[PDB]
């Protein structure tokens, strides 16, 4: 009935629903875009970033740095957490994780907030999320930087700063990266669940993850209480992706469909952008330049790697190396390979005959793809100049991507290709703006667009729809595209950060079970339809109600039938008094009396007790309890 939304980020939601007797957390999410306000963390101290001019104000200067007009923070990058203080997270009983992208910020919730509940997620999601936190902690703690910057967080000081730093919100709630001990502790509180697995939460509600088709282990959740069902649609995809397609059927008959994880850059067709990315890197490589591809180690990298494997053979570029640098590179490749049963029917059919599902095993076998754990190992020995490198965080604030941007940024021959849409490629590129590097933005987002979600909504027909307020308006870049909206027959109520929505799905008629012993004693009747009466004792255990074996009446007793039928059913000396809209009947034995009102009857006894029960029973010949 309630929904506490702890994050305003659309693709990184954190929603808690105080529905029935359990408060369930839907996703955690970590707004990584706060890192773009900070100066990047380089693997080796660069002269350009160190010698940047401090920003000037009337007062400080060493906290903030200026580069090509944009003003940044000379401090360790910080991450915008979901609102933890709006609702006491100790009361959260269960956390449901949909994607590994939404899996982040979980150490904060599990450790710092006194959360003692359970976390449910699918195994590929858990493993890939573990890899992501591994590489994030490795990048952050590789060359640590102090957190000296705190003056700029002041309420009266942030107003005078330029636009990217002024528009940052919840700055006081930003936190540094969690340590690896917290990551290991958090992942220990997790329960692995398979698709369509019914998990009972204290006998109250049943949750099942349903395949979303967006990523490996990506799942949509449906929470139901046997009469009211709440569907949670996170990032999902209806394309020809490797994971098994969306289970759209199970979302039907949903009272509330909370909808998050819709695509950014809706105007982009992912196949065309993949083709453009391949063509651009082929053009750059043909001219002898290098290519840098900031990406996550386990996200859209696999799809574009497959397309590159197909493309290079026709393009005559098999000679050039395909470097993949990340601390979790080999782990990412192996985890992608072993999760073969988490794929679609086309790709899971490769388990019958002996063959790995993904084709990049063939890239490794022919020594086309070469994965390394860092730059300082065997990579520096096997590095060939006209190459393409997938590495680093797409935020361009830590990882090996910082080093490669600082290295290849001085030449126009080299190019950087952005494929993840979750970071503003002009804002992530801000601390390096005076580069001559050729910068290309061809994001690949396979998530649902507004046409697809409109079709899905018309297919599912949910009673109420909940979405971020960003989807109830056209995007600010366009501001005139009515097609980039969630159009529903209901108004499709929305939310912003730290908003509480009182859902109208409150319904009665909770389910209960009656045992055969009591059902033997229960007998129905006929009315105008069947009906019965039940008197029993209620036994409740684990929020499951059982009916153990130990005022109103209804019928047709009009004045005429009352006077006629029961006139001489056993007594005598009965008179009828001519009362308006009825008749008053009383006996001379002890002035015992019977009075009837419109659609009502009642029996009076005057100094008599033995005949009163039989008087009531006589009228009970044709009186039900409807």
């Amino acid at each position: 009935m309630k929904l506490y939304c702890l994050s305003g980020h659309p693709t990184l939601p954190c929603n808690v629903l105080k529905f029935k007797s359990t408060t369930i957390m839907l996703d955690c999410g970590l707004d990584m875009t706060s890192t773009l306000n900070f100066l990047p963390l380089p693997l080796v101290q660069s002269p350009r970033l160190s010698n940047l001019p401090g920003w000037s104000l009337k007062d400080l200067d060493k906290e903030l740095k200026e580069c090509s007009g944009h003003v940044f923070v000379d401090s360790v990058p910080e991450f915008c957490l979901p609102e933890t203080e709006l609702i006491d997270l100790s009361t959260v009983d269960v956390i449901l994780i949909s994607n590994y992208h939404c899996m982040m910020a979980l150490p904060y919730i599990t450790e710092h907030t006194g959360f003692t509940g359970t976390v449910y997620a699918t195994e590929p999601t858990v493993q890939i999320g573990r890899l992501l936190m591994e590489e994030l902690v490795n990048f952050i703690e590789r060359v640590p930087k102090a957190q000296s910057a705190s003056l700029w967080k002041n309420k009266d000081i942030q107003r005078l700063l330029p636009s990217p730093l002024k528009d940052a919100v919840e700055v006081s709630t930003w936190r540094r990266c969690y340590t690896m001990q917290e990551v290991n502790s958090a992942l220990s509180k997790i329960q692995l669940v398979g698709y369509s697995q019914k998990i009972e939460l204290f006998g109250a509600v049943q949750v099942t993850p349903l395949s979303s088709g967006y990523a490996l282990g990506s799942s949509n959740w449906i929470i139901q209480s046997h009469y009211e069902k709440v569907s949670y649609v996170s990032g999902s995809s209806l394309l020809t992706t490797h994971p098994q397609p969306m289970d759209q059927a199970s979302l039907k008959n949903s009272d509330v469909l909370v909808l998050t994880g819709l695509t950014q850059i809706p105007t982009a067709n992912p196949d065309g952008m993949v083709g453009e990315f391949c063509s651009n890197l082929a053009l750059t490589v043909r001219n002898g330049g290098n290519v840098l591809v900031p990406c996550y180690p386990s996200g859209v990298i696999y799809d574009l790697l497959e397309c590159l494997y197909q493309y290079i053979d026709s393009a005559g570029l098999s000679s050039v190396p395909l470097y993949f640098i990340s601390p979790v590179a080999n782990s990412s490749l192996e985890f992608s390979q072993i999760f073969a049963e988490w794929l679609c029917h086309n790709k899971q059919s490769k388990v019958y005959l002996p063959e790995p599902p993904f084709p990049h095993a063939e890239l490794i076998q022919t020594n086309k793809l070469k994965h390394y754990p860092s730059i300082h190992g065997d990579f520096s020995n096997d590095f060939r100049q006209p190459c393409v490198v997938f590495t680093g965080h797409p935020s361009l604030r830590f990882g090996d991507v910082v080093h490669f941007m600082e290295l290849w940024g001085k030449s126009s021959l080299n190019t950087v290709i952005f494929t993840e849409p979750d970071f503003s490629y002009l804002e992530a590129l801000a601390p390096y703006q005076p580069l001559a590097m050729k910068c290309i933005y061809c994001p690949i987002d396979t998530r649902l667009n507004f046409i697809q979600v409109s079709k899905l909504l018309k297919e599912v027909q949910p009673l109420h729809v909940v979405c971020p307020e960003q989807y109830t308006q056209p995007p600010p870049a366009q501001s005139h595209r009515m097609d980039l909206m969630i159009d529903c027959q209901p108004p499709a109520m929305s939310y912003r950060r730290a908003e509480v929505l009182a859902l109208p799905f409150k319904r009665r008629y909770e389910k209960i079970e009656i045992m055969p012993e009591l059902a033997d004693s229960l007998v129905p009747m006929e009315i105008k339809i069947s009906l019965a009466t039940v008197s029993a004792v209620l036994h409740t255990k684990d929020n499951k109600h059982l009916l153990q074996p130990p005022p109103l009446l209804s019928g047709s007793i009009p004045v005429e039938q009352f006077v006629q039928t029961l006139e001489k059913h056993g007594f005598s000396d009965i008179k009828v008094e001519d009362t308006a809209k009825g008749h008053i009947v009383l006996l001379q034995e002890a002035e015992t009396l019977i009075q009837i009102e419109e659609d009502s009857t009642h029996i009076i006894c005057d100094n008599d007790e033995m005949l009163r029960v039989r008087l009531r029973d006589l009228v009970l010949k044709f009186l039900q309890k409807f």
Partner: protein, 823 residues
């Protein structure tokens, strides 16, 4: 603020804007004295507000405010209990109960408040919301007379499982507070062990462990069999049955509590290892699970149980040494540690030692060092195992040079314990031919040197070993007894402190000398103290501290004699002056005494800061000697006077100890200096510096210099690091840090390339290790990158200490060659 928050909450819209304002207000802290007004306003708005979420946030906030500093919340609990009584919604009621719990925990010494709190918790304990009952039980657990056990015990049968967990946790917390629980709780908890929820079972096994430890010798009768059994043994059986529980967290808990109990009978202890009282094969099933965490818990449990019972340890030997083959790293480390712990009560068998030796091939450093410590503490029964251990140790000697130290020490301890087993193996190892004089082995060969260390530590207990020595064996013994007396044992074949105090008294007494005599006496004493620091190890800190102070004084008086050599300002010559350099040197040395030494009490900090003030005055005077500008002179003058004022403010209790000092005479004429002309100020500052008295430096009882030794890169005899052009090369840095109390925030690593560029590195706390007191070990990687070089130059890597900004070197610089070749 009070009125600002009041008016803002009044003008804000009820459902969302008020919630946002409360969210903003909750982050910023509130001063203790102002808490009463703001909580009164929050209560008033709570009464006004109808929205449930806003009231919930108000309750959460005003519970948060009760934790602020030494605020006394005894004045804000009547309104709190009132609004709790009046509250309808369940979330707000639970949050108010949380607030009441916070207030009660803030005032544990108050009794009547806690009785009121537990009464109102009992009142709301029947609410239909599980959260309200959870918070009521938490109140009863944290707060309660020490009746309450019965009240909490009633909710072991509650339908909601999480209410049952809350009740068990409340009883456990009552026990932890000091309450003696009743034996009647045992039967109630026993029913909960068969619950369908893992949290209930975990809490129940915790509670059953608690009650067994409280009443171990009490007798409990079996329901079916007419057998009288001690309660601790019955609980042992119940917990053992829980080691087969489906959930792994319950298994981990069961293994841990099984470890924690030692009052159980011997036969019950023996039963858990036999194949076939439902405790049969409990550890057998608990040592071979899929989960590594339950295996670690079982290993630790076996450690505790074996330490309590040597007879049990004899049975546990084979099971625990078979666990060494387990390929989880933390599992095998814990098995090593536990085996070392139970080492005193045991002696390894032939086949068990064969088993552990066949899987003893370790690679990483930590596992290898743990094995070395285990072998130091081990006990073996076969000499063939000693031979195999020698073979593996020499393999690990030729494989890892940095393991030589710990393997030499290892074999030193191994022979001292097993002389009888080494005695046949002595001619097996010395290669003594029966009827030929054998070649004299290479005295620098570490393997051979470790064979002698072993054989000499064994010889200490064994008269028969000196006989089988060859001639060169006796010769080699005579050397390693002198050179390595800490490894090799002997076989059967104060004035420094007085001098320091005398030298310091000599310096202090002779402060009436002429400047030449004073500075030559200071030079003599500085040289003497430096030499004394070089000789003695314990007095190196004191000698270097005092010598640094005396060097500061010597620089000061030398600069003042240069000032005496100085003449009128426009004729001043920069190239021939060294007073500014003297001031900078005193600056850096004062920082050195403040931070680069330990055991520095405030009585030394005042003297260090006084010398710092003198150096700042000297720098001011020297700058005034040159600058013709009046505005900068005024600026530096008022800055120096502000520094003097801050010194007076901070060290106000120490001024009587600074008689005739520079700062004392300065403070005498304070307002005149405040209102005087800068030129006059400079003049009187010079005169007062020259007439100032040398302050005695009170020596600390214990003080050691902060030292560091870079050891991993070593000398430049290694070949250059190649293939680094553009990309990165990782240089592994190992270092031992001596007497640095807070190295993580202060120690930094500086890298100086052959150009002017310098890199500064801030190692994370995880790099620092603390194997001993005042003796750290820093292991990390520092990443170097630079463009291509024509010839392999050398990059200087040095460790610096940081202070607060500014840094000072405190380690010897090392150099390594890098050849960033392009490709």
């Amino acid at each position: 603020k009070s009125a600002a928050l009041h008016i803002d909450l009044c003008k804000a819209t009820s459902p969302a804007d008020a919630l946002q304002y409360l969210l903003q207000f909750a982050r910023k802290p509130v001063e203790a004295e102002s808490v009463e007004g703001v909580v009164r306003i929050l209560l008033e708005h709570y009464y006004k507000e109808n929205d449930p979420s806003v009231r919930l946030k108000i309750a959460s906030l005003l519970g948060l405010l009760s934790k602020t500093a030494g605020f006394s919340p005894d004045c804000i609990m009547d309104d709190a209990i009132n609004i709790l009584q009046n509250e309808k919604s369940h979330q707000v009621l639970a949050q108010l109960l949380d607030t009441l719990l916070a207030i009660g925990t803030k005032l544990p010494e108050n009794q009547a408040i806690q009785m009121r709190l537990v009464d109102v918790a009992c009142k709301h304990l029947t609410d239909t919301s599980h959260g309200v009952r959870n918070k009521c039980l938490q109140l009863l657990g944290n707060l309660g007379s020490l009746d309450v056990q019965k009240i909490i015990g009633d909710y072991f049968s509650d339908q909601d499982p999480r209410v049952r967990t809350a009740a068990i946790k409340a009883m456990l917390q009552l026990h932890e507070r000091g309450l003696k629980l009743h034996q009647t709780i045992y039967n109630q908890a026993c029913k909960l062990l068969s619950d369908d929820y893992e949290q209930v079972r975990s809490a129940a096994v915790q509670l059953i462990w608690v009650v067994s430890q409280l009443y171990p010798e009490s007798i409990v009768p079996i329901p079916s069999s007419n057998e009288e059994i001690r309660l601790v043994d019955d609980a042992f059986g119940k917990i053992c049955h829980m080691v087969s529980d489906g959930s792994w967290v319950v298994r981990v808990q069961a293994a841990k509590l099984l470890g924690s109990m030692e009052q159980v009978s011997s036969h019950f202890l023996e039963q858990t290892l036999d194949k076939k009282s439902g405790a049969c094969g409990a550890f057998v099933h608990g040592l071979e699970d899929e989960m590594y965490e339950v295996r670690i818990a079982a290993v630790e449990a076996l450690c505790m149980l074996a330490q309590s019972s040597p007879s049990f340890a004899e049975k546990c030997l084979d099971f625990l040494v078979d666990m060494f083959n387990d390929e989880i790293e933390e599992v095998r480390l814990q098995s090593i540690h536990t085996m070392r712990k139970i080492s005193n009560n045991i002696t390894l068998r032939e086949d068990q030692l064969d088993t552990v030796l066949a899987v003893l091939e370790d690679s990483s450093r930590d596992i290898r060092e743990a094995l070395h410590e285990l072998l130091c503490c081990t006990n073996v029964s076969t000499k063939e195992g000693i031979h195999l251990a020698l073979v593996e140790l020499l393999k690990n000697l030729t494989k890892y040079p940095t393991d030589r130290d710990s393997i030499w020490k290892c074999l030193k301890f191994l022979g001292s314990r097993h002389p009888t087993l080494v005695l046949p193996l002595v001619p097996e190892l010395l290669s003594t031919h029966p009827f030929f004089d054998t070649a004299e082995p290479d005295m620098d060969d570490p393997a051979y040197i470790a064979v002698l260390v072993l054989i000499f530590n064994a010889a200490k207990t064994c008269p028969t070993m000196p006989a089988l020595f060859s001639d060169h064996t006796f010769r080699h013994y005579a050397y390693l007894r002198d050179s390595l007396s800490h490894l090799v044992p002997a076989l059967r074949l104060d004035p420094s402190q007085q001098f320091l105090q005398q030298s310091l008294e000599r310096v202090y007494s002779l402060q009436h000398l002429d400047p030449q005599g004073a500075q030559e006496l200071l030079e003599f004493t500085i040289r003497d103290l430096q030499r004394l620091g070089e000789l003695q190890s314990e007095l190196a800190g004191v000698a270097d501290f005092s010598a640094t102070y005396l060097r500061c004084q010597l620089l000061l008086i030398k600069a003042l004699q240069e000032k005496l050599w100085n003449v009128a300002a426009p004729l001043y010559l920069k190239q021939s002056d060294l007073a500014s350099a003297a001031a900078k040197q005193i600056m850096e040395e004062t920082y050195k005494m403040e931070f680069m030494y330990s055991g520095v009490e405030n009585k030394q900090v005042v003297i260090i800061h006084h010398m710092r003030l003198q150096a700042k005055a000297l720098q001011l005077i020297v700058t005034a000697r040159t600058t013709r500008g009046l505005d900068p002179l005024f600026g530096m003058c008022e800055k120096f006077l502000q520094e003097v004022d801050f010194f007076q403010r901070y060290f106000i209790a120490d001024l009587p100890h600074l008689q005739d000092s520079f700062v004392d005479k300065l403070l005498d004429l304070m307002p005149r200096l405040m209102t005087s002309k800068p030129a006059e100020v400079v003049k009187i500052l010079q005169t007062m510096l020259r007439q100032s008295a040398f302050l005695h430096l009170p020596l600390p009882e214990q003080i050691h210099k902060a030292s560091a030794t870079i050891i991993e890169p070593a000398g430049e005899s290694d070949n250059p690091l190649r293939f680094t052009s553009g990309l990165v090369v990782a240089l592994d840095v190992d270092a031992t840090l001596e007497h640095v109390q807070d190295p993580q925030n202060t120690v930094k690593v500086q890298v100086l390339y052959p150009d002017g560029q310098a890199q500064m590195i801030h190692p994370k706390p995880a790099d620092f290790r603390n194997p001993g007191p005042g003796r750290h070990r820093l292991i990390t990687q520092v990443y170097l990158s630079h463009t291509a070089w024509t010839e392999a130059c050398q990059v200087e890597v040095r460790l610096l200490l940081a202070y607060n900004e500014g840094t000072i070197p405190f380690s010897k610089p090392v150099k390594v060659y890098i050849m960033p070749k392009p490709a």
